[PDB]
């Protein structure tokens, strides 16, 4: 149950930044966000991993914080990962 | 509302 409090809620400004940091992820690395999303959001498992629609409104804070922290491993630890 | 991210292959910028 601590998982619900351990995860901090992602605000609008943040979900925006998130959608922008996800947009920074290269095709191979962004298949992970689709995967994190599809897996953590089994309600969108009908969606294909190469055709995913990251719905930041349906994405749980957990997924969003994961997506965000995930991209940061590729973005805030490496400049332009598609270069 | 944050716009739904359309990930239709090759969306990296």
UniProtKB/Swiss-Prot annotation, chain A:
The lineage of its organism: Eukaryota, Metazoa, Chordata, Craniata, Vertebrata. There is a cross-link at residue 45 (Glycyl lysine isopeptide (Lys-Gly) (interchain with G-Cter in SUMO2)). Chromatin reader protein that recognizes and binds acetylated histones and plays a key role in transmission of epigenetic memory across cell divisions and transcription regulation. Remains associated with acetylated chromatin throughout the entire cell cycle and provides epigenetic memory for postmitotic G1 gene transcription by preserving acetylated chromatin status and maintaining high-order chromatin structure. During interphase, plays a key role in regulating the transcription of signal-inducible genes by associating with the P-TEFb complex and recruiting it to promoters. It comes from the Eukaryota. Residues 5-15 have a biased composition (Basic and acidic residues). Belongs to the BET family. This is Bromodomain-containing protein 4. Ubiquitously expressed. Residues 1-82 form the NET domain. The modification Phosphoserine is found at residue 1. Interacts with p53/TP53; the interaction is direct. Interacts (via CTD region) with CDK9 and CCNT1, acting as an associated component of P-TEFb complex. Interacts with RELA (when acetylated at 'Lys-310'). Interacts (via NET domain) with NSD3, CHD4, BICRA and ATAD5. The interaction with BICRA bridges BRD4 to the GBAF complex. Interacts (via NET domain) with JMJD6 (via JmjC and N-terminal domains); the interaction is stronger in presence of ssRNA and recruits JMJD6 on distal enhancers. Interacts with NSD3. Interacts with NIPBL. (Microbial infection) Interacts with bovine papillomavirus type 1 regulatory protein E2. This interactions may serve for the tethering of viral genomes to host mitotic chromosomes allowing successful partitioning of the viral genome during cell division. The NET domain mediates interaction with a number of chromatin proteins involved in transcription regulation (NSD3, JMJD6, CHD4, GLTSCR1 and ATAD5). Phosphorylation by CK2 disrupt the intramolecular binding between the bromo domain 2 and the NPS region and promotes binding between the NPS and the BID regions, leading to activate the protein and promote binding to acetylated histones. In absence of phosphorylation, BRD4 does not localize to p53/TP53 target gene promoters, phosphorylation promoting recruitment to p53/TP53 target promoters. It is linked to Cornelia de Lange syndrome 6: A form of Cornelia de Lange syndrome, a clinically heterogeneous developmental disorder associated with malformations affecting multiple systems. It is characterized by facial dysmorphisms, abnormal hands and feet, growth delay, cognitive retardation, hirsutism, gastroesophageal dysfunction and cardiac, ophthalmologic and genitourinary anomalies. CDLS6 inheritance is autosomal dominant.
UniProtKB/Swiss-Prot annotation, chain B:
It is found in: Nucleus; Chromosome. Highly expressed in brain, heart and skeletal muscle. Expressed at lower level in liver and lung. It comes from the Eukaryota. Histone methyltransferase. Preferentially dimethylates 'Lys-4' and 'Lys-27' of histone H3 forming H3K4me2 and H3K27me2. H3 'Lys-4' methylation represents a specific tag for epigenetic transcriptional activation, while 'Lys-27' is a mark for transcriptional repression. The KIKL motif recognizes and binds the NET domain of BRD3. Belongs to the class V-like SAM-binding methyltransferase superfamily. Histone-lysine methyltransferase family. SET2 subfamily. It is linked to Defects in NSD3 may be involved in non small cell lung carcinomas (NSCLC). Amplified or overexpressed in NSCLC. A chromosomal aberration involving NSD3 is found in childhood acute myeloid leukemia. Translocation t(8;11)(p11.2;p15) with NUP98. Interacts with BRD4. Interacts (via KIKL motif) with BRD3 (via NET domain). This is Histone-lysine N-methyltransferase NSD3. It comes from Homo sapiens. The gene is NSD3.
């Amino acid at each position: 149950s601590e998982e619900e409090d351990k995860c901090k809620p992602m605000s609008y400004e943040e979900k925006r930044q998130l959608s922008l940091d996800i947009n920074k992820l290269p095709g191979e690395k962004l298949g992970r966000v689709v995967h994190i999303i599809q897996s953590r959001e089994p309600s969108l498992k009908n969606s294909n991993p190469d055709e995913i629609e990251i719905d930041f409104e349906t994405l749980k804070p957990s997924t969003l914080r994961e997506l965000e922290r995930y991209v940061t491993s590729c973005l805030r630890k490496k400049r332009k990962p598609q270069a | 509302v944050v716009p739904k991210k359309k990930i239709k292959k090759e969306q990296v910028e």
